[PDB]
Amino acid sequence: SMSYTWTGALITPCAAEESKLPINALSNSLLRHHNMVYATTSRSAGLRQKKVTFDRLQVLDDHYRDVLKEMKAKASTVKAKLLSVEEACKLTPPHSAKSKFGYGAKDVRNLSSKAVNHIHSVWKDLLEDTVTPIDTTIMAKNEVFCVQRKPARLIVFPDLGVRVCEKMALYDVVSTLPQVVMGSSYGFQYSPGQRVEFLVNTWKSKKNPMGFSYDTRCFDSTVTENDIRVEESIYQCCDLAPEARQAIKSLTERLYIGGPLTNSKGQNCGYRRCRASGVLTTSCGNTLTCYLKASAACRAAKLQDCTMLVNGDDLVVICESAGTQEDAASLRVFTEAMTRYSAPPGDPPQPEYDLELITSCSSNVSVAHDASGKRVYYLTRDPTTPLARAAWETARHTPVNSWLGNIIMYAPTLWARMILMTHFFSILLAQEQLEKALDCQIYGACYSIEPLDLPQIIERLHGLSAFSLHSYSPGEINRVASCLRKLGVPPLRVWRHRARSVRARLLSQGGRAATCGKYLFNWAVKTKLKLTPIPAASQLDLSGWFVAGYSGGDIYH
Numbered sequence: 024s025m026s027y028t029w030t031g032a033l034i035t036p037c038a039a040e041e042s043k044l045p046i047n048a049l050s051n052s053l054l055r056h057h058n059m060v061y062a063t064t065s066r067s068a069g070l071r072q073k074k075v076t077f078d079r080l081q082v083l084d085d086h087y088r089d090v091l092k093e094m095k096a097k098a099s100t101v102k103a104k105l106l107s108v109e110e111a112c113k114l115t116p117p118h119s120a121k122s123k124f125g126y127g128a129k130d131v132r133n134l135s136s137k138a139v140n141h142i143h144s145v146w147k148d149l150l151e152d153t154v155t156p157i158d159t160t161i162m163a164k165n166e167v168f169c170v171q172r173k174p175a176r177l178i179v180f181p182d183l184g185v186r187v188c189e190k191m192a193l194y195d196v197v198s199t200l201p202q203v204v205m206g207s208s209y210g211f212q213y214s215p216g217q218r219v220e221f222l223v224n225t226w227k228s229k230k231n232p233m234g235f236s237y238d239t240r241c242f243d244s245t246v247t248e249n250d251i252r253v254e255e256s257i258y259q260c261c262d263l264a265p266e267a268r269q270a271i272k273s274l275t276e277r278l279y280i281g282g283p284l285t286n287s288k289g290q291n292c293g294y295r296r297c298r299a300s301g302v303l304t305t306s307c308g309n310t311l312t313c314y315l316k317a318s319a320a321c322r323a324a325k326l327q328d329c330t331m332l333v334n335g336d337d338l339v340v341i342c343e344s345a346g347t348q349e350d351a352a353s354l355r356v357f358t359e360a361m362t363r364y365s366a367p368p369g370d371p372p373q374p375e376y377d378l379e380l381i382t383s384c385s386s387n388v389s390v391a392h393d394a395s396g397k398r399v400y401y402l403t404r405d406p407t408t409p410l411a412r413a414a415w416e417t418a419r420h421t422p423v424n425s426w427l428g429n430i431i432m433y434a435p436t437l438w439a440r441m442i443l444m445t446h447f448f449s450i451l452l453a454q455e456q457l458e459k460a461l462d463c464q465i466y467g468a469c470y471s472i473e474p475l476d477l478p479q480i481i482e483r484l485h486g487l488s489a490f491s492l493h494s495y496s497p498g499e500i501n502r503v504a505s506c507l508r509k510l511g512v513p514p515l516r517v518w519r520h521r522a523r524s525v526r527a528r529l530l531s532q533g534g535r536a537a538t539c540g541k542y543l544f545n546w547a548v549k550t551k552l553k554l555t556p557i558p559a560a561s562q563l564d565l566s567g568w569f570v571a572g573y574s575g576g577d578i579y580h
C-alpha cells in the first residue's frame with residue numbers, strides 16, 4: 024500500500040520561519056561562513072512529501088516468523104503497569120504543544136481540572152471505541168544543518184490528551200520491553216561510553232571482524248500495517264492491566280496503524296498508512312521492527328555470528344568476515360532480504376574492517392590517551408552539524424539547547440572540550456546566567472540541566488578520564504580541523520587562548536564555577552592541575568538517562 028495519500032492541501036507553519044542563520048554580535052567569534060548554515064522550513068515540505076510517499080510490498084518468510092517467535096517469548100516475561108493520569112501528566116514537557124480542547128502542557132502539569140477531565144474522556148473513548156481513526160497534525164520540522172539542501176522532515180502527532188493517554192497505556196511498556204526482548208542489542212540502554220565498550224567488546228569477539236551500518240531510506244515510510252500490528256502482538260505478550268490491553272489495542276487500530284492528516288490551518292492533507300513520527304511508540308516500534316527485519320536478514324544472507332546494535336531505525340551489524348568480496352556478496356543478499364521485508368537502503372551498505380570508520384548513530388569509536396598514557400576508546404562524531412546548530416544558538420534562544428546536550432554526550436571529544444565548552448561558558452559568564460537551568464534532549468527525552476552540574480554529570484557518564492584526554496587520533500584531528508576551515512571557525516590555537524580566559528574568570532567566582540573552571544578547562548593550561556573525584560557526583564540521580572529512547576514521544580524527565 025501507499026505510505027501516504029495526499030489531497031493537495033499544504034503543510035503549513037504556526038508562525039514565521041527563519042531559514043537564514045540569525046546573526047548577532049557573538050556570531051563571528053564562532054563561525055565566519057554564515058552562508059553554509061541553514062534551517063529547514065515548511066517551504067520544502069513538498070520535496071519531502073515526494074520522498075516519503077511510496078508503495079510498500081512485503082515478503083515474509085520463516086526467518087522472519089522464527090525471529091518473531093523468539094521476540095514474543097522474551098516479551099511474555101514483561102509485566103508492565105498503567106501510569107495514572109497524574110504520573111502521565113508529569114512526563115509532559117512544559118513547552119509541549121497545547122490541546123485543541125482548551126488547555127496546554129502546564130495545565131496538564133499542575134493537573135488542572137480542565138486538563139485532567141478531558142484526558143479521562145479521551146481514555147474512556149479509547150476503551151469503548153476501537154475503530155474510529157484519531158486525528159493528527161502534520162508539520163514540517165525546523166532543523167539546522169550545514170550545506171552538503173535537505174528538505175524539512177515531517178512530524179505527525181495526536182492531540183495532547185491522546186499523548187497523556189499513550190503514556191498511561193504504554194510508557195512503562197516502551198521503557199522496559201525493548202531491553203528484555205533484544206538484550207545487549209538495544210542501544211538506548213547505553214551511555215556513550217557503555218556504547219563504545221559494547222562495540223569494542225563485540226568487535227573484539229570476532230575472529231576476523233566486519234561491520235556495517237544499514238541506512239534504510241525513510242524508515243517510517245517503510246513501516247507497514249503488518250509491522251505495526253506485529254509490534255502490538257509483541258506488546259500484548261506482556262502481563263498487562265485489562266484496560267492497558269484494550270487501550271493498546273485501540274491506539275494501534277486508531278492511531279499507530281495510520282489515520283487522517285491535518286495541517287495547522289485545520290485543512291485535510293490526506294492519510295497516513297505508515298509510522299507516525301510523533302507518537303510514544305515511535306522509537307520502540309522502529310527498534311523492534313528494525314531488529315526483527317535485520318536479525319532475519321542475517322539468517323537469509325547466512326552471516327556468521329552476526330551481532331546487532333539497534334537504536335530505532337539506526338542499525339549496525341558486526342559479524343565474521345567471509346573475505347572482502349564474499350562480504351560484498353553477503354551484504355547484497357542482506358539488502359535483498361531487508362528490501363523484501365519493506366526496508367530497502369538509502370545508501371548501499373559497505374563492509375568495514377576498521378571499527379573507527381563505522382558510523383552508527385551519527386557517531387564512531389575513536390581512540391585517545393588519558394593522564395597515564397593509557398589508550399582509551401571514546402565516542403566522537405563529525406562536528407559539522409553540532410557547530411552549525413551552536414551557531415544558531417549563539418544568536419537565538421531555542422526549546423532544545425543542542426550545545427549542552429552535545430557537551431554532555433560528547434564531553435571526551437576535542438571539539439566539544441575546546442570549542443563548545445569554551446564558547447558557551449563564556450556566554451553564560453557574560454550574562455551571569457551560569458545558574459539558569461536549560462532544557463536539552465538526550466535520546467529524544469527532554470531534561471532541565473544546570474550548566475554548573477556539567478563536571479559532576481561528565482564524571483558519572485564518562486569518568487575522570489574525559490577531563491584529561493590528549494593525543495587524539497590523526498583522522499579525528501584531521502576531520503575537526505577540516506570542518507573548521509569549511510565553516511570559517513577559528514583555529515584550535517585561538518580556542519585554547521579563549522579557554523584560558525574563561526577558566527580564569529570561572530576560577531575567580533569560586534563555588535561550582537571554580538569546579539567548572541577546574542575540570543572542564545584543565546586541558547587549556549600547560550601547568551596542569553591534579554584532578555580528583557567530586558563529592559556532588561554521587562548525589563545526582565541520572566538513573567533514567569540511558570534506559571530507553573523516546574524520539575517524537577513527548578517525554579520530559
Ligand SMILES: CC(C)CCn1nc(-c2cccs2)c(O)c(C2=Nc3ccc(NS(C)(=O)=O)cc3S(=O)(=O)C2)c1=O
Pocket residue numbers: 213214215218242305306307309334335336337384385386402425428429430432433464465466467572573574
Ligand atoms: C551514545 C550517543 C552519544 C550517540 C549519538 N546520539 N546522541 C544523542 C544526543 C543527545 C544530545 C546530544 S547528542 C542522541 O539523542 C541520539 C539519538 N539517536 C537516535 C537515533 C535513531 C533514532 N531513530 S527513531 C527516530 O527513533 O526511528 C532516534 C534517535 S533519538 O532517540 O532521537 C537520540 C544519539 O544517537
